[PDB]
Amino acid sequence: MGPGFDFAQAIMKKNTVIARTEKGEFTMLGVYDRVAVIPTHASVGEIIYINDVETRVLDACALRDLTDTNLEITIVKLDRNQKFRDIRHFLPRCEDDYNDAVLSVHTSKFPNMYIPVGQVTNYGFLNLGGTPTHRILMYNFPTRAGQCGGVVTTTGKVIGIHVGGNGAQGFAAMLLHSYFTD
Secondary structure, eight states, X not given: OXXXXXXXHHHHHHHEEEEEETTEEEEEEXXXXXXXXEEGGGOOOSEEEETTEEEEEEEEEEEEOTTSOEEEEEEEEEOOSSOBOOOGGGSOSSOOOEEEEEEEEOSSSSTTEEEEEEEXXXXXXXXXXXXXXXXXXXXXXXOOTTOTTOEEEETTEEEEEEEEEOSSOEEEEEOOGGGGXX
């Protein structure tokens, strides 16, 4: 409808796949080469389904900060025959607040879904399903089951992936450029 949705659509059309684990179906953001991200509570194993095709996982790393606190981001390298468009230049370098964000989801339950969530706060610490978690972004939108792994964007930046909500607020794990240096 506007330039926020235009940026979000450009990311969804080229840089997302549908990932299925034993824990459900998730929006999965491809970042560069065969490297993608998913919420850690997806419990990625040796094998994952990518757009309903059996795919070997070459590597999976559940990120934690230097105090050994959960960040809720798992970085997966997929045994796929094709690379993602490199979008690392759209990742923020530092923790920050944002205006006018969009949350975009693409699954069997929620195809081509886009939500204008508005203002995004650097919330920081969250007890997420009982797990102390850092680098959480918060938006005042009543997000629901089916949205985990959804991409949070502003115009020109990919800032996070949706990992939970409390019925009134939604919560994303930050994406930082430093997670994806090679």
